Design a protein around this ligand. Sequence first.
Ligand SMILES: CC(=O)CC(=O)SCCNC(=O)CCNC(=O)[C@H](O)C(C)(C)COP(=O)(O)OP(=O)(O)OC[C@H]1O[C@@H](n2cnc3c(N)ncnc32)[C@H](O)[C@@H]1OP(=O)(O)O
Lengths: 255, 255, 255
Amino acid sequence: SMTYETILVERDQRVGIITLNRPQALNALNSQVMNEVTSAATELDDDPDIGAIIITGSAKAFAAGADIKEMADLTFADAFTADFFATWGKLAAVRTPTIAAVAGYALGGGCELAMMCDVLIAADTAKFGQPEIKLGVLPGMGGSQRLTRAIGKAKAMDLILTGRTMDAAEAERSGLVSRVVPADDLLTEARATATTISQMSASAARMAKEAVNRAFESSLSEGLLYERRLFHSAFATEDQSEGMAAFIEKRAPQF
Amino acid sequence: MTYETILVERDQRVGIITLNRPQALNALNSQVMNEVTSAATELDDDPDIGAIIITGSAKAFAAGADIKEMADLTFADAFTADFFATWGKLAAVRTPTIAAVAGYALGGGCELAMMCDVLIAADTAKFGQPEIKLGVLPGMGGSQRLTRAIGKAKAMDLILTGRTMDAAEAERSGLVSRVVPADDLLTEARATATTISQMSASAARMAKEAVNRAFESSLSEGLLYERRLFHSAFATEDQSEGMAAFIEKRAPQFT
Amino acid sequence: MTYETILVERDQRVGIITLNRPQALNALNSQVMNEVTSAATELDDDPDIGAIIITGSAKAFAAGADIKEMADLTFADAFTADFFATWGKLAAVRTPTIAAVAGYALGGGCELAMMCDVLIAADTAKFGQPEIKLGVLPGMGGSQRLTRAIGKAKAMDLILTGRTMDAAEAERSGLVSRVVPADDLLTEARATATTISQMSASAARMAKEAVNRAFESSLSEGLLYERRLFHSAFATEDQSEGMAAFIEKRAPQFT
Ligand SMILES: CC(=O)CC(=O)SCCNC(=O)CCNC(=O)[C@H](O)C(C)(C)COP(=O)(O)OP(=O)(O)OC[C@H]1O[C@@H](n2cnc3c(N)ncnc32)[C@H](O)[C@@H]1OP(=O)(O)O
């Protein structure tokens, strides 16, 4: 069953939407959000009727940081024993394409959540940052890894060491976001994008996303070989036949 | 010397390979693949060539791939032939290569452009990977090279939705070296090719090889490799010449 | 220590290294390499320093490594000395470094800037890797750091042609953190340095190190490394203080 305390979930067509729902805390991420979001994403992933997954917050904040109260008295013993934050890894293991729709504050864990998704659509109001340094820690949800890989060392060092924010426009030309859309149009644009992707062959889309993810896990030489073999294997799927046949017959595919 | 799908011109120390299938918008197929790599190799081995341009028409650099060769392809066939692997001969070219890209560079075409070292784009250039729409995925390194060029967010967007990207976006995203007016594309490409071909051959070959290392190993290994190459250059006449010329406040004469 | 080629000053928790060969536009010779790395190491080891700035004159950050010194090299001198390897000492510096670049940052100068964590550019700054055309190639990590920063197409362009990149192009390409007016460069860098040095020293060191991992291994390994480092920060006083301060809406007192 799909009822959660900190999030809302809507299934429409082949698109699933995970809305962060903690207005009282500006959508701050806590242990329960981690567990609810990953559980939801995972269920949507196993659902053969779902072809794209959106993660979003409110117009005010995608997710403005984390509950510092959960972390405040945590010791290294509790941290190592619980493997604090490791559960977020379950989001990255989702095979179906994911879309972060980001309005307002995407800070700390919030910025890192956005970066875990495959596609990142931002409102013009979106503000990205990693202020963990200010709290005497550092990013714990992959920020030092994905940010640096997206925007380059100079900018990632700047944000992570000073804690400054980056607005939608800068994020777009720096490599962080896919596209910037007007604040009022965010949810509509994200659903439109999610629709397009969810209407692709589920198999082909899963493979493409997988191939892209390899670009960060090995040398180019190995990524090229992996992509080529995956490509070869797609010719064993019926969706490639239907897809190419649809192209020839100049029609919509029926996967 | 005579090719069915391409034209080859030599001008001084610059070789130019021009895709030549107007009737098909310079779409790639097995023949184009065999001919381009055959021509490029041959130019690579010619001591009187120091730079190679690959270009298409003003409307299409290469508008995609031939759907015919893929429509009834089985996994067994693709695996046995190692379909597309031959494009790897282009990467093995030691001499610097310049893709001069006008108009359409889609699917395989976009991938062809990404294989070159330098990419000069007409202001008319459109890039994209529409493989997903046909129920397959990039098979010529697109998911590897695009992602490394322009970051995850935008590569995922392009590869999963098939959306096009104009020349200006490509320039600020990391995909292209420079954007020039369409009428000036070929002229500008030859100027660049001329410049590169008049550098020391061995030094340009070491420089290209070093840059290529950046995608094949850790930074600490890449650093060691570059430094060793750099040291090696001191066993060439061209380094002594180039450095004497700076000190003597003159133009170098590489031989 | 007394230095012949640099100037060092300490102010609060900020150390500043000024390249001081004005007669050679701060060309980077072996003596500069040794002194900069010695000064940086000394500053790194001083518990009263929390950030380090490296800068040149308003006319040049550094206009290449010293060509006169290099003309005097055989392959044997270079291999035996492991020419340029000592610059690695600067990468071993745990404390955050900020390159404040005005005017010329060419070859070794551009490379030195890229070695630093944060890069602040005057609007007047010019970047380049013109080593080619001395009949050599970058020897201080240029082929590695530039390529990872700005993508293949532009790094090949710059490295094979020797063309210059203005500060504005560098900022949108991935090379620089921020661009500021030439008159405000030293002021802006000091502000950034101050911000960074007033952070928890251990947090900053961890964060910087985490970010540096993004170039040394796969994403999955970088992710794990970060999380372990994040857990270990909960064994530090500063984590406890940094977070208690935030909850209590006050200013942190790091020890
Ligand atoms: C580690 C690596 O990867 C390898 C190295 O970086 S390769 C270094 C390659 N460097 C370059 O090609 C450019 C070097 N410098 C220049 O081209 C020019 O100085 C410039 C374009 C930066 C501006 O020149 P300018 O404003 O007209 O003044 P200019 O007269 O050239 O320089 C002033 C003095 O500093 C010297 N100088 C400038 N750059 C130098 C360098 N990289 N090495 C040794 N001396 C240098 C000049 O020779 C001159 O002194 P002398 O006439 O007495 O010999």
